[PDB]
Amino acid sequence: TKGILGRKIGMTQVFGENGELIPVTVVEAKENVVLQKKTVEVDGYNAIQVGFEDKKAYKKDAKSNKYANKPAEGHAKKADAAPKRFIREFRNVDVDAYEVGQEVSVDTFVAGDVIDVTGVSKGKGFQGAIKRHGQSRGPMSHGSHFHRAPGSVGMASDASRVFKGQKMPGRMGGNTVTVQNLEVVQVDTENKVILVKGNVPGPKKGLVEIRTSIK
Amino acid sequence: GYRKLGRTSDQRKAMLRDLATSLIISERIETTEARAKEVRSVVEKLITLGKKGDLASRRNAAKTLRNVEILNEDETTQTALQKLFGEIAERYTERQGGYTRILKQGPRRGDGAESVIIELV
Amino acid sequence: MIQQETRLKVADNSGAREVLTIKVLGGSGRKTANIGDVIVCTVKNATPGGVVKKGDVVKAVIVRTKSGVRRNDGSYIKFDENACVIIRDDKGPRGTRIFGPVARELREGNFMKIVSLAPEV
Amino acid sequence: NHKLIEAVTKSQLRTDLPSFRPGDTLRVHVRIIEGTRERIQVFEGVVIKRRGGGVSETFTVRKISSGVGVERTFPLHTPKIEKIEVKRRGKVRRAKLYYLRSLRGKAARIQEI
Amino acid sequence: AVPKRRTSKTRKNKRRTHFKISVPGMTECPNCGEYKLSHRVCKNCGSYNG
RNA sequence: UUGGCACCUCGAUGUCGGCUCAUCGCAUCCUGGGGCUGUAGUCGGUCCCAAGGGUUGGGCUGUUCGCCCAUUAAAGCGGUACGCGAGCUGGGUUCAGAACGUCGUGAGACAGUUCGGUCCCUAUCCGUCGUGGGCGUAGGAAAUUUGAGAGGAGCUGUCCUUAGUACGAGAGGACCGGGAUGGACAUACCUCUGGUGUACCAGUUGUCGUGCCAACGGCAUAGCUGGGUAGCUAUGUGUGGACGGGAUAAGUGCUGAAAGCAUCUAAGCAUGAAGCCCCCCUCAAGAUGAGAUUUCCCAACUUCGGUUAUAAGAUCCCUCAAAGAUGAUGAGGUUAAUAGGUUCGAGGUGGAAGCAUGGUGACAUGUGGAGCUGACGAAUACUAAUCGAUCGAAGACUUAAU
Ligand SMILES: CC(=O)NC[C@H]1CN(c2ccc(-c3ccc(CNCc4c[nH]nn4)cc3)c(F)c2)C(=O)O1
């Protein structure tokens, strides 16, 4: 089991050996080090921390998150590394990795071919019941005065209330989803990019998490 | 486009052209904050056509500028197009972009709208 | 063909000229059917030179669709009209001639007689 | 055109194909593996559209088999295509020749340069 | 839909808890000496001079 | 279900079908596990466990019901004011008009038909779907995170192969195991195939204006017509229900007595379901039982035994979008590439203007795949993100262990 982080770049396509189309997502993964290691003695569970993208050093103003503050600056010096945003933990991986900082490259995912990707957001904000839960509309001719509204929300005077878990308008998108059983096309050196079959969640420039498939 | 400014398609092009021809005759006007960010791009693209000087540039600038008689020359009814390509284009012959400066005044009475002042640098 | 009330033209050498779809076989709630699918249809206009008469419930395979079909290598093929061929229970056509071209993928081990009778594949 | 996009795309792009402009007769030699053996089949028609891109660039060819029209779209840099030649050129005044679909006979012909 | 019941002084005064306004957020200009808004000109004698 | 009774409502509790959205029961229609058989096999007929998921489009009728057509693994029966009109419709019945049959001396009535015919309401409280502030968690902060709990998911077909084998006079044709590819449904996404694309490009009609010709602009749905970038999208492109443990129901058992034999049960020991608890996915310490890890900070005054400001940090204001009703969340504020402009590209349109040449002309050909170009990728401080202000600690008492 292994895992890294990266930023979604875009969608492309490659040609197979005999010749076909494979939709491809471009994901760059660079500057991944181990910031901390956790054991069963303290906090009672094994894991490793990873940092993705290094940021600037300590500054006097530091009013735009581009510079690491004092609690984070002193956090990345114990691992002999640089302050890196986007810290995440990987529990499935084995603990055979030095607690001191050591870089993780994309070349470890060679011949993997079975992974899963975690998305961070969708970004819709749409409220309508037709668009959010995929409901049917009403007639548009015939004198109808019911086009895109939700129908009844319960029975009459038997329960005399609305049950929990109804399908009503509200903010949609921007939740954690995970696509399983993808494949790795090719790992490219000197660019630190990974080619994955299909498509990953999230918009461009968004953080993704690639782990070894659990099934 | 960029922002609708609370008008329709044909009304928006008639208003953006009215402010651009006003910033050439007076070089300083008072307006709203949201409309000042839009006319900022309309005038800065007309100064670029004035630095070229070709006949194809004089005709590409006649599609925006209105026909008004600036007396800034003070003689001979100079047009809004003749002030451009002339003294305006000579002032910014070395400057590369950024020929506009906007200053903020405050919320006005009866509207609560941000009054601003936009002028040629 | 694609839906329940689609009008299809019969391409093989039989009395049927235009047919009206009635059902799409394969699973329940099945909505559409592309090239290579068997359907149940009825004869609307018939030719006296043929054996099938007006108002006959028959089966037929789809051979041409205006929508098209996508292949594994990433290429698409699309036709100008819609067409079908009346077949038997064991995939045998009712007619000894096939008119017009035929989609390149019907030799799935079951329609060998149709592709051979086709003039151009 | 992100810089990391062409870095991986540069391995798939081909160059031996000759440049053609929409509205000319094109003779395409396509390899088909249909059946136990493989062989080459020729496709001859007129180029009606060509949308841009990088590796994902396609073109459309339309011909007439017998009274009915046939249209086929191929990716430009596919390995399935073996060779492409330009038999005849034509004079048009637009990039998308969508009006050819409705016409037939003496109206579906294009003048030559 | 009409109100089924009257409104209390307690319920009316709880709803207007957040019905307030804040300080305009002003600073002092070291050219005119008077208070002024941020990122704006001194409304009295002076200018921006950023 | 058709009734019986007349207990609540006549200073109003809106009736039939259909549409949208569901939820519950088991007396089970399909799938899963079994006993018996007048069960050879393939298909069945009965009864016993089992409610996890699934349970289709049309013609006729206002119709419920019912008949019929073509499919399906199957086209289940009921409760919820015969669910649902401050969510929709108004074809039926019970308004004023008119006509037929019939009845009455008549004005008029139906154990009956026919054609028309006003459906109002800005959500106070509980309820539900989203999203912020305040205080708390015995110091004040920045990141990572355990999971007591809670929700989501749960379906199935056709061929191939064991095998033309077991079984059977022949026809006909498997259980049990192993592959391939679909149907419906659910989710992410825009590289392809399409749609849209009102500050992109190009053709063209009538009229007015820039003094005129050339070249442009206003108005007529965006005047009309042919294309189309980013974004948002399905009908398009990927993925998912995988594979296993533990305890059980209906069943089958082993050993074994009460009852010298016998016997699944009383002691004891196994096996055994699409169901139960987990494994897979998401939320989750306001879990007041308020958890854990890592790093950053640490004085001056007081006789109050307690205060004030500052620190770490976080905000006011300002430029923005990967976010968004507002707010919140993210990328940045001159130790600066955050957004405009400028300078080069990608994609889109398809040959600008001027001049030259060839025709009496409308036009055509050259310099030239020219010119133009919103939302996409880079480089560049040229214009704005000035100067300032507010908030925020100095760690309670008792008992054990040192
Ligand atoms: C108008 C109003 O506001 N009423 C307030 C009260 C009264 N009411 C109410 C409502 C509906 C009815 C009612 C329901 C069905 C039928 C059957 N029809 C067919 C038929 C048979 N024979 N002949 N025709 C008749 C009447 C009622 F009997 C009572 C309610 O719900 O509250």
Side-chain angles (χ1 to χ4, degrees), chain C residues 6-116:
Chain C
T6 313
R7 289 292 179 97
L8 281 151
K9 310 210 271 174
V10 178
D12 67 276
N13 197 26
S14 181
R17 305 190 61 247
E18 299 89 41
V19 286
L20 182 51
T21 304
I22 297 176
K23 193 60 71 166
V24 171
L25 292 186
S28 158
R30 173 80 175 276
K31 290 298 184 177
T32 82
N34 221 335
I35 286 172
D37 294 330
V38 186
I39 63 169
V40 183
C41 45
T42 180
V43 188
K44 303 298 297 189
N45 299 336
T47 298
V51 310
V52 286
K53 280 311 170 39
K54 184 174 76 174
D56 273 18
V57 173
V58 299
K59 286 194 174 177
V61 64
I62 311 300
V63 69
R64 280 206 293 279
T65 54
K66 265 187 59 77
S67 66
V69 67
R70 175 187 198 269
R71 290 192 187 85
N72 213 18
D73 60 356
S75 44
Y76 307 80
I77 175 168
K78 294 154 190 162
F79 298 90
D80 194 329
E81 61 194 45
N82 292 311
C84 47
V85 161
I86 301 174
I87 62 155
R88 278 142 50 208
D89 60 79
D90 49 60
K91 312 147 202 53
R94 301 299 284 166
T96 79
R97 286 177 57 79
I98 295 297
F99 296 155
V102 163
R104 312 306 191 260
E105 43 265 31
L106 270 81
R107 46 167 61 92
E108 283 313 273
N110 57 7
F111 297 144
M112 48 197 319
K113 180 50 156 198
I114 316 288
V115 54
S116 88

Side-chain angles (χ1 to χ4, degrees), chain B:
Chain B
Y2 300 79
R3 62 169 92 251
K4 306 203 186 65
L5 288 176
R7 300 196 192 276
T8 184
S9 278
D10 50 306
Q11 282 163 10
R12 196 158 58 242
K13 203 170 62 186
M15 191 193 65
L16 258 56
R17 285 176 61 177
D18 263 347
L19 289 182
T21 187
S22 316
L23 204 67
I24 302 308
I25 50 185
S26 296
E27 303 170 13
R28 198 165 87 189
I29 57 175
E30 302 170 342
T31 175
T32 307
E33 179 194 43
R35 301 170 201 165
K37 309 211 211 75
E38 290 311 307
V39 76
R40 157 181 72 181
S41 158
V42 184
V43 179
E44 281 176 347
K45 293 195 186 304
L46 280 178
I47 303 174
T48 304
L49 287 174
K51 292 181 67 158
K52 307 287 184 176
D54 272 0
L55 183 56
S57 315
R58 266 190 186 246
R59 299 191 170 176
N60 286 15
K63 329 212 166 170
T64 296
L65 285 186
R66 302 284 191 183
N67 224 336
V68 303
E69 312 316 327
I70 332 191
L71 226 140
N72 263 339
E73 176 157 333
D74 275 284
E75 103 108 324
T76 218
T77 218
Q78 135 200 269
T79 87
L81 191 85
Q82 291 207 11
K83 180 155 184 287
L84 208 64
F85 294 83
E87 40 187 350
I88 279 185
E90 293 197 70
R91 285 159 54 193
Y92 317 135
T93 185
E94 202 82 338
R95 187 173 287 269
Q96 310 185 20
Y99 319 105
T100 295
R101 171 189 281 120
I102 320 180
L103 299 153
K104 306 169 77 168
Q105 301 296 108
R108 66 183 182 178
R109 179 190 188 261
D111 208 6
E114 171 70 57
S115 162
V116 300
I117 281 179
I118 170 171
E119 73 269 11
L120 299 175
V121 55

